[PDB]
Design a protein around this ligand. Structure first.
Ligand SMILES: [Br-]
Ligand SMILES: [Br-]
Ligand SMILES: [Br-]
Ligand SMILES: [Br-]
Ligand SMILES: [Br-]
Ligand code: NA
Length: 129
C-alpha cells in the first residue's frame, strides 16, 4: 500500500506513535517519506546481506527474521514480511522498540540526514488531526 501523507499521519497517530519518546508526528512522517516514500512494500538490501523492510525500512540484522541474515537477531520477534502489510501495526510496534534502544531516531539514517533539524511540522501541515 502506498499511503497518502495525511493518511499515514492519521494512521501513525491512531497507533500512538505521535510524540512517542518525544518525537512529534512530523518526524515520523518525514522518516517514512524518505525511507520508503510511504510504500509499505518497500524493500532494500544492504551490503552486509541484511535487508530493510516496510514503511520505516526496519533492518533484519537486528529486528525481524527473514531467514537469510545469518548472524542476525529478531528483537521485535516477527517475520520481516509482517512489516510489509497494508496494516502498519507491526511496523509501528517495532519502531517504538527501535526508537527506545538508546539512539532515538538516529537509528534511521535518512531521518538523521534528511529530517533531523528541519521543519518537520510541514509534513503534517494541513492534515485533519
Ligand atoms: Br508527499
Ligand atoms: Br536469519
Ligand atoms: Br493502518
Ligand atoms: Br540518507
Ligand atoms: Br510535527
Ligand atoms: Na534477523
Amino acid at each position: 500500500k502506498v499511503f497518502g501523507r495525511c493518511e499515514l499521519a492519521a494512521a501513525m497517530k491512531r497507533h500512538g506513535l505521535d510524540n512517542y519518546r518525544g518525537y512529534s508526528l512530523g518526524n515520523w512522517v518525514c522518516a517514512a517519506k524518505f525511507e520508503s516514500n510511504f510504500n509499505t512494500q518497500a524493500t532494500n538490501r544492504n551490503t552486509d546481506g541484511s535487508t530493510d523492510y516496510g514503511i520505516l525500512q526496519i533492518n533484519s540484522r537486528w529486528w525481524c527474521n527473514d531467514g537469510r541474515t545469518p548472524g542476525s537477531r529478531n528483537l521485535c520477534n516477527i517475520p520481516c514480511s509482517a512489516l510489509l502489510s497494508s496494516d502498519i501495526t507491526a511496523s509501528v510496534n517495532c519502531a517504538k522498540k527501535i526508537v527506545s534502544d538508546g539512539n532515538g531516531m538516529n537509528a534511521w539514517v535518512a531521518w538523521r540526514n534528511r529530517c533531523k533539524g528541519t521543519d518537520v511540522q510541514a509534513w503534517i501541515r494541513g492534515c485533519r488531526l
